Design a protein around this nucleic acid. Sequence first.
RNA 1: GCCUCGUUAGUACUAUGGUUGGAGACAACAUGGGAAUCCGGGGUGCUGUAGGC
RNA 2: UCUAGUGGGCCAUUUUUGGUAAGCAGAACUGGCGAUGCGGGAUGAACCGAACGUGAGGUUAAGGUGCCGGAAUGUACGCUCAUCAGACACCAGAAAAGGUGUUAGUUCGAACUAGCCCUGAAAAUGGAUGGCGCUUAAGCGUACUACCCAUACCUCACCGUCUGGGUUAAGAAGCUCAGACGAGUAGGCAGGCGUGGAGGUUUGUGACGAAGCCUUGGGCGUGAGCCUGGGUCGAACAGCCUCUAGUG
RNA 3: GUACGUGAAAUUGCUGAAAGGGAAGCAUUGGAAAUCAGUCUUAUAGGUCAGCAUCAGUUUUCGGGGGCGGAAAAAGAAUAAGGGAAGGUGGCUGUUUAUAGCCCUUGUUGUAAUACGUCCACUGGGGACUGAGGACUGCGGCUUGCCAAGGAUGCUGACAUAAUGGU
Lengths: 168, 159, 186, 214, 56
Amino acid sequence: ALKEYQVVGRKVPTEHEPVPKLFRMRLFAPNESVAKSRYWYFLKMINKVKKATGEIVAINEISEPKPLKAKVFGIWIRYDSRSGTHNMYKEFRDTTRVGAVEAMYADMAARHRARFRSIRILKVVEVEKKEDVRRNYVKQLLNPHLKFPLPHRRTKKVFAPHRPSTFY
Amino acid sequence: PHSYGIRARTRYTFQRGFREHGQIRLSTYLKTYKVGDIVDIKVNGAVQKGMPHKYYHGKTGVVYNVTQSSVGVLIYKVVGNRYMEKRVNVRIEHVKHSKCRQDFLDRVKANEAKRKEAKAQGKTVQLRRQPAPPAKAHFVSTENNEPVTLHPVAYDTTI
Amino acid sequence: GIDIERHHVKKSQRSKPASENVYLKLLVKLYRFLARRTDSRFNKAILKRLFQSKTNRPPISISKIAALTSRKSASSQNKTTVVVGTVTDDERMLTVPKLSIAALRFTKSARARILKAGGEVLTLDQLALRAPTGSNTVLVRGKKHAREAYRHFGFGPHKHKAPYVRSEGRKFERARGRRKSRAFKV
Amino acid sequence: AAEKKSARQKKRELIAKRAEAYEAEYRAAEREQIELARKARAEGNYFVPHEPKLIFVVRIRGINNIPPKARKIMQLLRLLQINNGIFVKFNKAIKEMLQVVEPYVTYGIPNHKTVRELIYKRGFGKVNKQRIPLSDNAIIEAALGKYSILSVEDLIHEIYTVGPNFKQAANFLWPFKLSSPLGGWRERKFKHFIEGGDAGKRDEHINGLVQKML
Amino acid sequence: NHTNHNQNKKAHRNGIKRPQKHRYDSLKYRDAKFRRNQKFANRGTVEAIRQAKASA
RNA sequence: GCCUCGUUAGUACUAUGGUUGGAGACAACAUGGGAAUCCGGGGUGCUGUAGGC
RNA sequence: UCUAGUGGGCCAUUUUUGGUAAGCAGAACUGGCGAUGCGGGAUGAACCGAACGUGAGGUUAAGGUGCCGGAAUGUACGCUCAUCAGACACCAGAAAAGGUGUUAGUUCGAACUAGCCCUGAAAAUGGAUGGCGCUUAAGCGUACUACCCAUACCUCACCGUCUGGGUUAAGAAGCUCAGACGAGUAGGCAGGCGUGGAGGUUUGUGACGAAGCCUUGGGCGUGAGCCUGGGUCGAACAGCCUCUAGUG
RNA sequence: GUACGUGAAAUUGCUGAAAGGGAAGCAUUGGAAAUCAGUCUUAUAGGUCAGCAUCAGUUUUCGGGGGCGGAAAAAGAAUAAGGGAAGGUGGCUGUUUAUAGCCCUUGUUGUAAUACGUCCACUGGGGACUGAGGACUGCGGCUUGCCAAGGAUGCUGACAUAAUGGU
């Protein structure tokens, strides 16, 4: 349900800073309210600007330019754990940045038991060259002659009359 | 168990400020207090005469009596389920005027003034303070202020 | 549920007299109509004072009515005086002026003295015809706090109230707490 | 005989003209904001929309286990019951008052439909300390007539645009006794809205909530 | 023995009620020299008002 | 040495919240408040009345 | 203003003292229990949700939807194989260190860092994720819709209280309109029900059956209680206004 | 019938009825059996239970048309250009559209569409519960009468029954 949001904001004008700098972030959140909340969260930790003394100057939703093209996205994240000392880089093959990020969130939760609060996404980039891909499974999907059997066939009306064929 | 002396647990309240010990400033004795004046009680440890109780340190009240070297202050003290009027005779060394009442008096003077010119011009004047309004719509120019894109920083080991 | 401060806050009023006097019930009926069907704040007051109890309707006297009606600055001399209660006599006044008084009850001495002096005595229903809206009326009250109980109410340390003593005298609550020679004075 | 109806007919026409002006004001303001946003986008600058002055506050927690400070504040907001709504001005005093009761109320920016549907379906007036439904314009005549509020649509305009008489109009409006939301709340109702809960400020999503509770 | 848990709740049941504020306070608590002065000034002021009313 | 401004720092800490994480210790997050030393820049009295040169 | 009861408290959050520890002793703020049901936690005084007049309909909270059990043997992506796995806060308890377990990550084949599982791990009637059972889960992590239902919320009907507006044309102690609300121990107050005796009253009931008694009969009231049909019986008894008390 | 007025409850025997797999009793809801009354019978109007219609109040569930907004969606299609490499097609493991194509950039069709967000005092169905009040007053709409506008009526049938309801 995520949506990529470009949020631009700045601290309120003051006598010491008549022309405050504008900071912009591309961050993924279910809605605009959370997107602004995370945006102030990152600025509050870096540039010394609070939501009380700052303001959101622009909010925009970024849609995927080519959602009908299969791509590979490499994501750097700062995973937070029981020890909290972890940097992860992962690669996911998908057609949209939002889809790749959502797949990343599910993957981190499933494998390392990471929540939305623990994970923060450092950067999402598109890998265009096959040789740049370092993940074996992604390269296996990049095999020119990819082909595999259909897995998990599984196919109310209880009490079927004949034994299922569950095959080809 | 407790000891219930008058100056018990007043070690830090009645202590003189750091590098503020010694002779008391002389301007304290040259201020005139009249009945109805608002005063803040702040006990000075140097003058041990006319001291109020440690409850009245930091309390604000209205002067009801003026004496040769002291001032009668009316404080309302919470006693169970009611307010009790407490009349403390405190020497002027422990008393100072409340800047809030001054500021109110200057605001009253300004409000009466604004009313005078308003009636002279035949217009109505806005005299009541308003809480901070919500921010107005305004433009923000990006000329020579191009937004810089920020990304969260990776973890580093710096002790 | 609802967050309400107080529940079923009954008013401290009386909707009808505790008296069973049929004539008082008749006066209540008349003045309930007058208060309900007129904008006379006087009639509302008379209805309220008819509901009131005996201790809330203390006596008033001929002299006190004379004093309150013969003030210098006030020109309320000929106006009809209204009391919801009795009008006792004051024998200390040797000569009674001419007064027109309407009240619930008059003592025999007070009524005789008024009529002999040349005034008139009215009932509340009669004043409901002379001055139905209470125009040109001086509505007065007796000193409610003149009862013996108010000598004692609020008794305590340094309240200067009367104690409940079985006998006023020297051996009766005068020593410990009543003089500085015996410990302390309260 | 007919003088009263003649005056009443032109009174009704005046109400129509004022409501027509109010609708034009809403449309003009909405279009004006859109054009300003478009021109700022086209020229590369940023135009910030005005911060909401009107807020709609809905109580979400029951009447049990509440601290004394929050309990007093919701008493001052007249949110004495779960699923109760009020219109409120947004300023410095109010913002800090709502900050205290963040876990117990949810507030956001109401749009024109939210205000209008609330005042029509669930519009009740405080007439002689009684909760009288706004079934006729004469009821508002007798209560806010001296404030130049003559009709339900005038009352909506006062609430929506926050006119000089917002306090009297808001206090006249008995707090809205909304129903439970159709479709349910989120899974955990008593988190913050940012955390996937439903308390606290939810910006324009108070409209989606109000549509459910009506 | 001893606790303060319920006492604040018991205190606010009937509010923390303030004492009644009257226009004039007692000239007790005041300086005796000041108090007797104010008698004489008030006595003369009463006389002055009455004489002025009588002559006007 | 002292007095201010910035760095420290939205750091330390803290009010409210969760059927949050963790065996605990404790930690993160959501809505708010928000320091101190170190360090660096600037400064080394101002002023009232009465007079004298 | 007058007076009752109370003057044994206990639990939870956070802060904290004495203590090897404690379902330990002692405090501070707030909320609960005591005095309080109801939905959920299998069950439980204070946990979570929500506070309660009698009902109809709708919608929800906390919690849940394989069966017991109302509600998807739902959708998406993963992890896990356990020779006595795991299964939802409070909570019914576990550790350092480990693994030719496995899935991932970080850095120069190697060291690691992280999840799940296993080892560490060790009791006495037969036995407890609540039970059955469950393994591309009906386990664990995360997202997403649909659905289930509290006395909570919403509309409505009725009951009572309180509150406000009318009523000289209507046992005016009457009539009429409207809104809000409804937990309760100790305790308070109001209005009623029932018992014995007294004054008044009812052209009162009664040997053609009073009172009393029994009753798989009938009616009234929220209730205390009242009325009545049938049977049994044999000499007295009741309604209304008031008085009284050895009155339940 | 002196074991004597009335003759209660505990407890007991007989008869009839029903229930009973390691308690019983109790509350809610209905079945079954037993039992019973109101009601009607009458004076156009009225008894019991039903079905539909048109309304009103409350709510639920499917569908359609339209406006506005966003990068005035992103894409895409068709059609013109430039450039590019491949996980390399034809041509011979290697190359750059050929006997397959893809990607990047730009124009035209385009003021494209769809999705999403949002609003309509736009609209079409299906289901359920409810009918309080009782001459007239009002606010409205229509055109004086009418009306979905200050709370249900209309048209019918069955049974008049132990049917509904009570125990």
